[PDB]
């Protein structure tokens, strides 16, 4: 179970990476390919990653009791938001999106929720 | 292009949500913090290499020596995956051929079915510890 999950996640990661690089291949510029590879392996590929509960309050990695406005909006509107920020001197893109409350989640979650929380991920675009 | 970066970022977010969905349905909600550390670590993308139609690496380390795995992926037109212990961790390396899709054909003559290959290595140690 734990291994299958790890394997599934790994295969999806590979799918993501080739789809990502396909966009760079479309440029017909080797320079762009080299830079992408360096960027995805770097520590700034995923500079931040936080998961929030339905109340827009962070749960992982650092539990908080203060709601995150962007998450609040993403959940309320049920849409993905994105905004630029300069973090530790780097230009980045942050995405905030809600977790759809699929029927299968009802076993442990409120079946009536539209969304079960949010995710915030920040990646460098330097 | 910012739009390309955004599209890619969007799919990254999608992967993460799909990954966490897995931990949840498997009853492993408590492993999310560990998942996050792993995703931000240098072990997420442990290696990434691109090869041409002759299975020779073009980036980031140009080589004239063919990669047997890539070679088979391209010749067979299929994705190969193998477990390997690297950098002190149990990992999964996936070898994928680049299909010459319609959009690609605007430059690559449709004669070739695949244009090369990609190797990606990620840690799967979390699956054991
Ligand atoms: C694909 C359906 C599901 C989705 C989208 C989902 C989503 C979420 C989200 C976004 C959170 C809040 C943030 C976090 O704790 O990291 C959460 C918390 C939680 N989920 Fe789920 N979940 C799903 C299925 C499940 C299932 C089936 C279980 C029961 C086996 C479960 C048990 C929990 C628990 C125990 C928490 C509390 C975690 C904590 O605060 O420490 N979830 N879930
Ligand atoms: C998603 C569709 C595409 C894929 C999958 C693709 C794949 C590849 C692969 C695997 C290589 C050899 C490895 C490498 O040099 O990195 C390559 C080289 C190349 N491709 Fe593409 N390609 C695509 C679209 C395009 C387009 C649309 C153009 C023209 C605008 C193009 C122009 C080139 C050029 C010029 C090279 C030679 C190396 C260089 O970039 O200087 N490719 N392509």
Automatic annotation (TrEMBL), chain A:
Binding sites annotated in the UniProt record for heme b: 25, 109
UniProt-annotated location(s): Membrane
Family as reported in the entry's similarity comment: Belongs to the methyl-accepting chemotaxis (MCP) protein family.
Protein name: Methyl-accepting chemotaxis sensory transducer, class 40H, putative dimer with helix-swapped heme-binding site-containing PAS domain
Organism: Geobacter sulfurreducens (strain ATCC 51573 / DSM 12127 / PCA)
Taxonomic lineage of the native organism: Bacteria, Pseudomonadati, Thermodesulfobacteriota, Desulfuromonadia, Geobacterales
Name of the gene this protein is made from: mcp40H-20
């Amino acid at each position: 179970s734990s291994l299958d999950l790890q394997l599934k996640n790994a295969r999806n990661l590979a799918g993501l990476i080739i789809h990502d690089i396909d966009g760079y291949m479309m440029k017909g510029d080797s320079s762009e390919v080299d830079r992408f590879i360096s960027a995805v392996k770097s520590k700034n590929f995923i500079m931040d990653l936080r998961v929030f509960d339905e109340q827009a309050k962070e749960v992982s990695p650092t539990p908080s009791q203060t709601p995150n406005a962007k998450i609040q909006q993403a959940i309320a509107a049920g849409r993905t938001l994105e905004f630029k920020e300069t973090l530790d001197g780097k230009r980045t893109l942050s995405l905030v999106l809600p977790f759809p409350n699929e029927q299968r989640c009802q076993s442990c979650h409120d079946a009536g929720a539209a969304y079960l929380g949010g995710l915030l991920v920040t990646t460098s675009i330097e």
